[PDB]
């Protein structure tokens, strides 16, 4: 919690306030000193001290309820959250990451590891819905904050919790990773809309790792192997070099030295 905190509220959220927020999140995720073919890279986990491993996003809503998500700076993804005197973490994929996560919310007695990881395929199963059937927007994020808040006192069932994680991860982590997805959320906020993400957003989320690898292994930006994505109508298309992604992808996971 001495980790850096970025605050956002859904109470009176605007295009501007959400933009300020996502830009602030990006600026705390990485210094931006490391850029490949114009795209910033997140810090290398190798060489990253534990006291720089995480950032905290404190979310508040119209009900003045507040929860604090923790993001891993190496991949911009949510690893867990605190509400009051309880905190909860996805089951990590390995022992090194699990050890790092013990450095989060250390003043909380009641810390828990969920049975499940935070990958979307499992969260969707637990939520009882796929990402394409879960609405995003200021309303959904407001609801997700309350759901995360009431989970420690028994007021939130697991499916609603998992849904709420899917909402937060996309509107925060994926929006930080992709200006495209930030823009998709800006449009929803602008027109006071809630709607689910279409295949163009889902396939970018799915392919973020693959895109990071393709860009960093490229020859002056030209991909060795095409990366496949989908358009809004679900038709498949291929990306063959970084230039078309410069307006689209804002952050990459570190894969190799420049």
């Amino acid at each position, epitope marked *: 919690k001495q980790y850096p905190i970025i605050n956002f509220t859904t109470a009176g959220a605007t295009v501007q306030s959400y933009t300020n927020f996502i830009r602030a999140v990006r600026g705390r995720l990485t210094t931006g000193a490391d850029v490949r073919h114009e795209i910033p890279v997140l810090p290398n986990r190798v060489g990253l001290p534990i006291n720089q491993r995480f950032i905290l996003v404190e979310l508040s809503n119209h009900a003045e309820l507040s929860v604090t998500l923790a993001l891993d700076v190496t991949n911009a993804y949510v690893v867990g959250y605190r509400a009051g005197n309880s905190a909860y973490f996805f*089951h*990590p994929d*390995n*022992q090194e990451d*699990a*050890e790092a996560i*013990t450095h989060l919310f250390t003043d909380v*007695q*009641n*810390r*828990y*590891t*969920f*049975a*499940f*990881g935070g990958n979307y395929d*499992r969260l969707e199963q637990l939520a009882g819905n796929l990402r394409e059937n879960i609405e995003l927007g200021n309303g959904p994020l407001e609801e997700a904050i309350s759901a995360l808040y009431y989970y420690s006192t*028994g007021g939130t069932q*697991l499916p609603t919790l998992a849904r709420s994680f899917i909402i937060c991860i996309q509107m925060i982590s994926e929006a930080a990773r992709f200006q495209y997805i930030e823009g998709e959320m800006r449009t929803r906020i602008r027109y006071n809309r809630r709607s689910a993400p279409d295949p163009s957003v889902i396939t970018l989320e799915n392919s973020w790792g693959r895109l990071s690898t393709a860009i960093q292994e490229s020859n002056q930006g030209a991909f060795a192997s095409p990366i496949q994505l989908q358009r809004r109508n679900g038709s498949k298309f291929s990306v063959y070099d970084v230039s078309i992604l410069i307006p689209i992808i804002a952050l990459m996971v570190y894969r190799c030295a420049p």
Partner: nanobody
Amino acid sequence: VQLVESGGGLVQPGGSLRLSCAASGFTLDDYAIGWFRQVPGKEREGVACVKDGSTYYADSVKGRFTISRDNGAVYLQMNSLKPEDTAVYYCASRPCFLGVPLIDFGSWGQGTQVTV
């Protein structure tokens, strides 16, 4: 702490016990749960743990102990008990990996005593 151990006691070698880990206000189904052992003079050792899709055991207890979920609780069925199994047993929500390492959040409760 909310996760409470019960079921400890005295048995002879070859004997059996079933320990329970539960919370009065909520189901443990949503959480990764491990059973850990601490014999006097050392530090807590992973015995068995459960998460989504995986169960792991310490080599010491393979084929003798069983961890399972039922009744919103997590049980440790201990069979063919050896004197080497004597310890205070603790349950907690902790990560579950091969070899049941303890990657500790640091909050524990009273545990339950087992004597063989």
